């Protein structure tokens, strides 16, 4: 593949989540996340010129916003100090979120915590089933499903 195709794929994935909110200001994100559980998150467009996307997340100390860098074909969280080998970066922005949700299943300066999305709209029943299946198993090619639906499951492997 080439980069334009991998990025197209990542954005199509993002459009499947049900928790990509499009144009949404800082204040609107704050109002939506005010009373939400810690770790509730959504992705929206960044109003900054150098970034496509921003994560809004309910923290310990209230809602905040972390821009998502896209560099050398991969998404990574904005960081104030980094070591390249230490910062998780993925072709897929949903993969990046899913990685940190999986990491955070195990539990002064605020700590990042990501748990559950804040849906802007209800995903399709097909996609919701796919999420549930992904939470049940990583091995879908042995399931009693026609291969057309195994292909469907393969298009979106994440648990969020």
């Amino acid at each position: 593949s080439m980069q334009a195709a991998r990025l197209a794929k990542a954005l199509r994935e993002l459009g499947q989540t049900g928790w990509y909110w499009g144009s949404m200001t800082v204040n609107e994100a704050k109002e939506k996340l005010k009373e939400a559980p810690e770790g509730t998150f959504l992705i929206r467009d960044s109003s900054h010129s150098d970034y496509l996307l921003t994560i809004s997340v309910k923290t310990s100390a209230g809602p905040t916003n972390l821009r998502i860098e896209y560099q050398d074909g991969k998404f990574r969280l904005d960081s104030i100090i980094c070591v390249k080998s230490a910062l998780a970066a993925f072709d897929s922005v949903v993969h990046l979120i899913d990685y940190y949700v999986q990491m955070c299943k195990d539990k002064g300066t605020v700590h990042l915590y990501l748990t559950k999305p804040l849906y802007t709209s209800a995903p399709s029943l097909q996609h919701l089933c796919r999420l549930t299946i992904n939470k049940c198993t990583g091995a879908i090619w042995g399931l009693p499903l026609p291969t057309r639906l195994k292909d469907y499951l393969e298009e979106y492997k994440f648990q969020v």
Partner: peptide
């Protein structure tokens, strides 16, 4: 899967 690491957000 990923080993948990504390992440400060400043």
């Amino acid at each position: 899967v990923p080993d948990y690491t504390s992440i400060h957000i400043x």
